[PDB]
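pasting input
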Amino acid sequence: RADQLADESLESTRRMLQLVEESKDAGIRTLVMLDEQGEQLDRVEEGMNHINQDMKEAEKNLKDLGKARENEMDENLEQVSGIIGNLRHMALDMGNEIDTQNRQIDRIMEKADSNKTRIDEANQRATKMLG
Amino acid sequence: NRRLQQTQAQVDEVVDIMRVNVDKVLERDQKLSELDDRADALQAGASQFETSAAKLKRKYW
Amino acid sequence: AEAMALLAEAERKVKNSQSFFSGLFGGSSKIEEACEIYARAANMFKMAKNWSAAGNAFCQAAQLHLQLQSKHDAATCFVDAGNAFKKADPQEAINCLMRAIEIYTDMGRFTIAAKHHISIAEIYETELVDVEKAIAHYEQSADYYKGEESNSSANKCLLKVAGYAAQLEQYQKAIDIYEQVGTSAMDSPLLKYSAKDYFFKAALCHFCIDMLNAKLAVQKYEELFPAFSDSRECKLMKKLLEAHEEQNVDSYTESVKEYDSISRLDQWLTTMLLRIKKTIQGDEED
Amino acid sequence: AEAMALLAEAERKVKNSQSFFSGLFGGSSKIEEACEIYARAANMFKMAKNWSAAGNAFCQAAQLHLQLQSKHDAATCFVDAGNAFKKADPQEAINCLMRAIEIYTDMGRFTIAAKHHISIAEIYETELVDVEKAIAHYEQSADYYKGEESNSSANKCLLKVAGYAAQLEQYQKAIDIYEQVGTSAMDSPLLKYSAKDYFFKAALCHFCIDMLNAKLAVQKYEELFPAFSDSRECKLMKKLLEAHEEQNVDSYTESVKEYDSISRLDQWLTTMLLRIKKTIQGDEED
Amino acid sequence: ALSEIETRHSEIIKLENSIRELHDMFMDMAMLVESQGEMIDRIEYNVEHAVDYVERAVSDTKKAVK
Amino acid sequence: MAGRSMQAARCPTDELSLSNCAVVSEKDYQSGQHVIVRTSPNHKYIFTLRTHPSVVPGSVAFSLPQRKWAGLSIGQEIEVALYSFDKAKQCIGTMTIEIDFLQKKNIDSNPYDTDKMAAEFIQQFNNQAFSVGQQLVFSFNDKLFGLLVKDIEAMRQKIEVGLVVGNSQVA
């Protein structure tokens, strides 16, 4: 048991790597997207802004027209440590991407709604002058 | 030796980092989930405006 | 701006005009005016946290919107009604949502239809406790997701389907669902990661087979010992298969106690593991 | 509410009005009515799971939409049809997508064009099994991504290109891609750790060179000893470079067996490693 | 010294333990973020396209007054 | 007397668990009668009844060993019919038994006088039914064993099932 633990747990330290390494792989796909999506939402936000503009004009037109075993076991830890730093790297990129976009969602939701109203009002004045 | 009894918290601390990382992302899911029902539903009304604006074109233009 | 007053005037205008009122033109807008009224009512109803009334109010503005020809913004109202009743104290949360999907479906909006479809199957289970219909919805919903290229979500629902299917005796149908969701997961080497647990669940689900359906399912599983994710799936399974094939309700009951260390056993696993723990003793005493 | 009926009415209205029925103003509105008809049909064909019919229906509404002068919302239909045919039983899946890209591409929409371009190269591989055509698409698509300063997606495609390029035979053409995707990866400290595997792949790929292209590619790599990420990259490579430069196919196959412990190997690696195993055996008995 | 060798193991496992679970989170993570990634691919679609529907409307309205 | 449906149950107390007798209710059968349990068209077994104020009317309780031998389950449907032995051919006179420690939990190498066993064996299992290949438990000096009938001889014709009496020898 004594050795079945100083080695088995040692295998866990070795595994402790792929465990925190597979996490990076899982983090990459996330970050890679969070970044890709970040730029996407930029062109997406343009939509809420593009519509925000046109609607103003559209409304006006509708208004104008409407009217050594332990030595290694100690090293593996250092390995985990070096990787722990990485976990911080992603934790920040993921964090700064989350907070920057959440607030972006706010602006999107705002303008999107603001324009929704203009569409409804215009749709109630246009539907009548149909055909 | 001591590194073992020590490094133990070097991860228990990260276990907390992800605990928030898993939550942060999930919080965005709901923010984007609702935005998915108000943004898509938004253009839905725009479709009504596209049809209305198209007809006002075949009568006054 | 009295609530019940708005509810009254809204009724005063929600009706085909006639006499001098009808005048020259009809009133396709009257009905819309009424919708806006009831909405204004449900607003203050949601204010005083009287939700119930708010929901019943939205049901009115929504039903009226249909009598105007505007399925879109109408269905959205049915959603508002559902959210109200849901968070509210009465029921109706099920009716509004059904009346919402029929619209998102007929119109041509399956993305959102499935979005509310999962909410539905989720309520019909955690509330009404009607799994026989919940599964039906979880499934049809996953089908819609699987047609929107939306793979993940589709699987999200499938997991629910099989998950609650095995908790209803449908053990075999469950392993089959796990096989499908397992095959439609390898195509994405970005899912390789979760495709394990599926094999674990599927190997655990037993329709009382006398062959080695599990010893075979664990074999089909490509695993390498040095692997880590994998050690959290088949490794345990093998030991459980041996403890079953040897009618030993001790090695199994102790292996499930050990694995519970390296990997915490959720509710599901627990319930099923106990079902197998009884199949062993039952086979000992058969 | 019958699809078969709608498909008929649509036809009756989709046709450049003739005689008195035409007059002066064309049928720019009629063609649109037909599009709406077929759309409604494709819709109920999708709830019925008749997919085939759904897809062909969308194809109709789409083609007609083109006959209306609205490439945008048309192409959109082409995509819907593609999503139908894909999760269906007939073909057309490849045709609809090409018909969609020709539009997003000539309309000024490369972002989405590449989005479907990769989908295409993905289907032409996971279905048609046409690697050479798929590579061509993964490549031309990565050019667009890299143009939309989406380096990230660009590389996502390049990895595909090189990856399957080494499987076909193009070992050299593979390393070149790994070199490019490797130089354009260091400019982003968010890919440093991943930049290893690239050098591992590029060093593994051999176009039957006699020099030390690999012994040089491994040297170009910057590694030390107290690094653990790098441990899963070149450290092994050198051992393999020595097992190749000494025609010892048991030390190569023994080291692959050891490395398969600290970092479990995948299908790709396996296939290539065996290829290198055979080059060694073939140099021994010669 | 045994005592230290046994106490060592005790702390090592308690460490090994906390580790395995943290790994469990990423697994579920990659399954969540991806399930959300597809929920955005349609957004970008419905957005830049809605810009076309609105653009076509605002244009027709202008040429309906001049 | 033609046969009736019953429901298998668990043995009331341990005392009746060492008698190797099917415990029944006093509202159905009576102590001293014999029955033939039927689990399937090709599985017939014979036991001895022993009433008890705990058994519920319309059900027969069996011990752990019996359930393993007859392959019975707790809560299954079985048909029980009164069986009448023939004291002209089923009278046991020489029955060989295969004894061995029931529970491998307490296995010793101490000596056990057989003469004393055969004496207490008939003094407890008299006027009962025993079949070839049957499995039961023997309480000898607070020690539990696992008997296994190998051969039965009447008073020499080898029979399948017999009835142990007072003048019955055991090996």
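fyi The CA atoms of residues 47 and 181 of chain D lie 44 Å apart.
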